[PDB]
């Protein structure tokens, strides 16, 4: 929590065109005409076994 | 134009709609110069970019009626005798090289289709 207060004060002082360069996230076509600028996190689960329905992409690689 | 209609019909689960499209393929197979019609029919059921066949497109998208769609597609390749080439196709890209149809059916936990 004490390091998190340091990060948000360094962010308020750097100028506006630096904030566009150091921006997190990526545009994703979530649904029909819906783009949301999302953040990606990977996981590994060895207990919950189920067939996979409701993915976004069929090809499971890191495309490009 | 026909190739994209089959990939949509198989992914969604369109059982009745699938049958006249394969019949329309049979309509275009009676009429040709007739030189390489076994190699021609593989060209209409395989995406040329990667090598994904319509059987591979079926198993990635599990439907409540995906058991019968596989049963139709195995009957069709038997009648035209490209059954070994159709059931043993592979991807050609670097990221997926060598993946087959039953390699997908095991990961989707489908015991009975396998």
From Swiss-Prot, chain A:
Expressed in keratinocytes and hair follicles. It is found in: Cell membrane; Cytoplasm; Lysosome. Residues 1-64 are cytoplasmic. It comes from the Eukaryota. Belongs to the transient receptor (TC 1.A.4) family. TrpV subfamily. TRPV3 sub-subfamily. Non-selective calcium permeant cation channel. It is activated by innocuous (warm) temperatures and shows an increased response at noxious temperatures greater than 39 degrees Celsius. Activation exhibits an outward rectification. The channel pore can dilate to provide permeability to larger cations. May associate with TRPV1 and may modulate its activity. Is a negative regulator of hair growth and cycling: TRPV3-coupled signaling suppresses keratinocyte proliferation in hair follicles and induces apoptosis and premature hair follicle regression (catagen). Homotetramer. May convert from a homotetramer to a homopentamer to allow pore dilation. Interacts with TRPV1; may form a heteromeric channel with TRPV1. Interacts with SNX11; this interaction promotes TRPV3 trafficking from the cell membrane to lysosome for degradation. This is Transient receptor potential cation channel subfamily V member 3. The gene is Trpv3. The chain holds residues 694 to 757 of 791 of the full protein.
Swiss-Prot record, chain B:
ANK repeats lie at residues 1-31, 53-81, 97-114. It comes from the Eukaryota. This is Transient receptor potential cation channel subfamily V member 3. It comes from Mus musculus (Mouse). Expressed in keratinocytes and hair follicles. Non-selective calcium permeant cation channel. It is activated by innocuous (warm) temperatures and shows an increased response at noxious temperatures greater than 39 degrees Celsius. Activation exhibits an outward rectification. The channel pore can dilate to provide permeability to larger cations. May associate with TRPV1 and may modulate its activity. Is a negative regulator of hair growth and cycling: TRPV3-coupled signaling suppresses keratinocyte proliferation in hair follicles and induces apoptosis and premature hair follicle regression (catagen). It is found in: Cell membrane; Cytoplasm; Lysosome. Belongs to the transient receptor (TC 1.A.4) family. TrpV subfamily. TRPV3 sub-subfamily. Homotetramer. May convert from a homotetramer to a homopentamer to allow pore dilation. Interacts with TRPV1; may form a heteromeric channel with TRPV1. Interacts with SNX11; this interaction promotes TRPV3 trafficking from the cell membrane to lysosome for degradation.
């Amino acid at each position: 929590l004490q390091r998190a207060r340091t990060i948000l004060e360094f962010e308020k002082m750097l100028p506006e065109w630096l904030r566009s360069r150091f921006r997190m996230g990526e545009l994703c076509k979530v649904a029909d005409e819906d783009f949301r600028l999302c953040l990606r996190i990977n996981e590994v689960k060895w207990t919950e076994w189920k067939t996979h329905v409701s993915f976004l992409n069929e090809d499971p690689g890191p495309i490009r | 134009r026909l190739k994209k209609r089959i990939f949509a019909a198989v992914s969604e689960g369109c059982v009745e709609e699938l049958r006249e499209l394969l019949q329309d393929l049979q309509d275009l197979c009676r009429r040709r110069r007739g030189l390489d019609v076994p190699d021609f029919l593989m060209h209409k059921l395989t995406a040329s970019d990667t090598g994904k066949t319509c059987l591979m497109k079926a198993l990635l998208n599990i439907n409540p009626n995906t058991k019968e769609i596989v049963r139709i597609l195995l009957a069709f390749a038997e009648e035209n005798d490209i059954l070994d080439r159709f059931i043993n196709a592979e991807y050609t890209e670097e990221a997926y090289e060598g993946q087959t149809a039953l390699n997908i059916a095991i990961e989707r936990r489908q015991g009975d289709i396998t």
